[PDB]
A paper describes a structure:
[name]-[name]-2 [name] is a cysteine protease that acts as a symmetrical dimer and displays positive cooperativity for substrate turnover. To examine the detailed binding mode of the compounds in the series, crystal structures were obtained of [name]-[name]-2 [name] in complex with the 4-methoxyindole containing compounds 1, 3, 5, and 7. The overall binding pose was similar across the four compounds and in line with what has previously been characterized by Hoffman et al. The P1 group inserts into the S1 pocket of [name], and the cyclopropyl moiety inserts into the S2 pocket, whereas the indole maintains its position across these analogs.
All four compounds show a covalent linkage to the catalytic cysteine, Cys145, with contiguous electron density between the sulfur and carbon atoms and the C-S bond distance 1.76–1.77 Å. When the warhead is an aldehyde (compounds 1 and 3), the resulting secondary alcohol hydrogen bonds with the Cys145 backbone nitrogen. Compounds 1 and 2 (both containing aldehyde warheads and a γ-lactam at P1) displayed sub nanomolar Ki values (average values of 450 pM and 250 pM, respectively). Compounds 3–9 showed clear evidence of reversible binding, whereas the more potent aldehydes formed a kinetically stable complex with [name], with compounds 1 and 2 having estimated half-lives of >69,300 s and 30,500 s respectively. Taken together, these data were most consistent with compound 1 forming a 1:1 stable complex with [name] but that there may be two or more bound forms of the compound 1:[name] complex. A second peak was observed at the 28-min time point at 63.9 PPM, consistent with the thiohemiacetal expected upon covalent compound binding.
Numbering used by the authors:
A (entry chain A), B (entry chain A): 1 to 303
Write the structure that this text describes.
């Protein structure tokens, strides 16, 4: 038993991280087939970051201006293009370690593993959720851009995130692998504020089901509620509205534990209205919302 | 910025996980050079687990009774021995993916990454600490035995843990790669209780330094204390005694933040005596003790 914030095994993605240097800037790139994907602000100087005109800046760049290094192997760049906020550099060599992969744009509330990298070599792995405000609470320093977030389905790596920027509140922002930012953010050094960080309600319910499964059950009460009589309490505490689709997603967990979704909702309402009173749930003194129901089933079933 | 529970990239260890089957039992094994290491209770039946005589049980086993599978490749077993609580099966093929590796027995308070596996294939990665009572708070189901914990120094994988058992309190127990259990535990199905789970004080101080670095500083006070006048409060709350060696280990962090270790100790005393009062530190409502000072420096420096 036991429930942990668990990340996917990262070897398949480790095999795809390279170093991209342009001018003074060095960041990470993702090498799949004969293409290297990287953030486009690799072509910016410290001066261009305030007000970059990426077309004009990119037009002054030739193939040989892009230094791509996989380990110690220098890749030859034979073409380059810009798709939204992502540069795509064509190299002359297909990555021998290219896995079965997809490009997926995940929905808010979904989770994925981030492989934090620096200078094209891996540094660490951790699990993140796409917040309702399209940010992530990660751990990124300078040079971490180009690091990717991904999921794994058997052997297919679904790349969903590439890191671009840290916001003033310390959360992080990025794009999908097609270069489209999650949320309203843009890749320049201006005043950018993320909106209200609301809680992923279905994820908290899934985490409570994981708690029940792993023995923690003090938070279970004799009450029940209705979906509207749960939402009029969730909106007060900045919780995402619970829909019948969320209820059905939580179906298998409710059937495994024998606890109706609305009764667990009553327990969660009691937790929101009275707090933890100094107790913990699965070793946490906060309500955790970065586990999807799929994460819970996968970790409690051994996938 | 940002501070996360971060695990090592697991590809080098993924390349070493195989499936070991004996009779009905199937668990994981670690394939390095021409040797596969696995827990010895792979030779037990459900009946032998209460009172196993591992010499007598192993003596009834021949090489061909050990089915080793790396992916779909069947390894041929050409010898077998028992070292403490670990079986070592000699195979005819050296693992082509054997990394630079060490066998290390870590001290309590140190951390490592666990690669949770089932049927010899990886399932997830997460960071754990060796508690002062020589247990770990992991996530292990049936068939997870043989999963390993490790650290990485540039390119050298230091294997330090192999999982064997879950205790009644839901924490987990295991051996080093030489087969010696951490703590007083034995690999049989008897009444085994871990002792008092005390807190790794130096790790909480390192985590508070990480908090200060990442902007969280509300817990900083105008007070100071002495080491004895901190220990007579730490022992009340079941905190490991702080030694001058722990102070010196925290030296670089204190010099980077400009906060003396004893002043941070006064802040921690205030936290232990008055609680969090509904606040959070680095997104946690509890004092975290599974980050070593090295973990903090590594994550805030980008190693
Ligand atoms: C790429 O490696 C890097 C990400 C690192 C830097 C520090 N922490 C991280 O997450 N990205 C950047 O430095 C980008 C530059 C790209 C054009 C987007 N900029 C920021 O992350 C950035 C800019 C600003 C502010 O600008 C006014 C204000 C507050 C925080 C900021 N972060
Ligand atoms: C090996 O895969 C497995 C580890 C799994 C099983 C459930 N959770 C895990 O961590 N190990 C075992 O099942 C071992 C068997 C080996 C001889 C040690 N046994 C236990 O983990 C075990 C035994 C008992 C109890 O026995 C009285 C009481 C309470 C909890 C127990 N766990």
């Amino acid at each position: 038993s036991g429930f942990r914030k668990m990340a996917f095994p990262s070897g398949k993605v480790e095999g795809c991280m390279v170093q991209v240097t342009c001018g003074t800037t060095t960041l990470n790139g993702l090498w799949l087939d004969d293409v290297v994907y990287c953030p486009r602000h690799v072509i910016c100087t410290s001066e261009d970051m305030l007000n970059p005109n990426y077309e004009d800046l990119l037009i002054r760049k030739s193939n040989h201006n892009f230094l791509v290094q996989a380990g110690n192997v220098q890749l030859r760049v034979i073409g380059h293009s810009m798709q939204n906020c992502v540069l795509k550099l064509k190299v002359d060599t297909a990555n021998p370690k290219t896995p079965k992969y997809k490009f997926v744009r995940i929905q808010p509330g979904q989770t994925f593993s981030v492989l934090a990298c620096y200078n094209g070599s891996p540094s660490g792995v951790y699990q993140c959720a796409m917040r309702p405000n399209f940010t992530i609470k990660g751990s990124f320093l300078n040079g971490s851009c180009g690091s990717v977030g991904f999921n794994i389905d058997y052997d297919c790596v679904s790349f969903c995130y590439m890191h671009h920027m840290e916001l003033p509140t310390g959360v992080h922002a990025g794009t999908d692998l097609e270069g489209n930012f999650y949320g309203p953010f843009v890749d320049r050094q201006t005043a950018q504020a993320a909106g209200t960080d609301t809680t992923i309600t279905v994820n908290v319910l899934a985490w409570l089901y994981a708690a029940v499964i792993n023995g923690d059950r003090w938070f279970l009460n004799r009450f029940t509620t209705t979906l509207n009589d749960f939402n009029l309490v969730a909106m007060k505490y900045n919780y995402e509205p619970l829909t019948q689709d969320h209820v059905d997603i939580l179906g298998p967990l409710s059937a495994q534990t024998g606890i109706a979704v609305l009764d667990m909702c009553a327990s969660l309402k009691e937790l929101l209205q009275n707090g933890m009173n100094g107790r913990t749930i699965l070793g946490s003194a906060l309500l955790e919302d970065e586990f999807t129901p799929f994460d819970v089933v996968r970790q409690c079933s051994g996938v």
